[model samples]
Target: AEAWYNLGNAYYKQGDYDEAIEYYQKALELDPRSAEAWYNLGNAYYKQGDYDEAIEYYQKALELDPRSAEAWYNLGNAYYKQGDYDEAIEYYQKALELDPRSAEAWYNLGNAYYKQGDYDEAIEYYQKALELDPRS
Candidate 1:
């Protein structure tokens, strides 16, 4: 299962989303409780612009490992792509609670707030994100 997951990572990095999903699915077949595999599957689906499918796999990943900030962040991204700002904000908040210093989570929270026309809150989060990761 680990080997399959690695192959999925390779395919994902190569931008072969279909192949990545295939390998990730195989990994999940061997270990259904593998949260990383499910998260990788979600990533592949997201790369393919299949936000709904990404959301499904991300939900599975979260169910297996609710403490994974990355899974929660990705789930928030899927919701953001689907134009569900409220849902995205909820998941992003969950991710931030798990890891307050996550620059990406803070950045995405800013984006969500900006989308909802809350410019002041967006600016605050964006500033936090920048503070957390100057390179970002």
Candidate 2:
């Protein structure tokens, strides 16, 4: 399982998402309970810009491991890419609730609110995100 998953990781790092997707599927077949494998599958699909597929796999990963802040963040990103700001906001909020220190999630949430024309909420979220930003 690790061998297949590791190969997928290698392919993913090389930006070969097609190969990564296949290897992740193979790994999942061998160990369907692996949330990490499902998460990686979602990531490969996300890289390929298959937002719907990524959302499905991310949901599967989240179901297996509800506390994965990264999965929630990625799911929000997928929704955002597909122009579903409401869904994106919900998932981003979930990610932030689980991992409050995630500056990206906070920033993304602010963007989501901005997309919906909620400037008041957007400014507040943006301020919080800036407060958490550590790239200085």
Identify the leading candidate in terms of TM-score: 2
Off by over 4 Å in 1: none
**Native-to-model Cα distance after best TM-score fit, residue 86 in candidate 1, in Å:** 1.4
For all predicted structures, in order, the TM-scores are 0.92, 0.96
Cα lDDT tens digits for candidate 1, 47-131:
9899999999999999999999999999999999988998999999999999999999999999999999999999999999999
Return the lDDT, model 1, position 65.
97
> Between which residue pairs do clashes occur in model 2?
none
Q: Model 1 misses residue 94 by how many Å?
A: 0.5
**Residue 130, candidate 2: how far off, in angstroms?**
0.9
lDDT of 2 at 83: 91
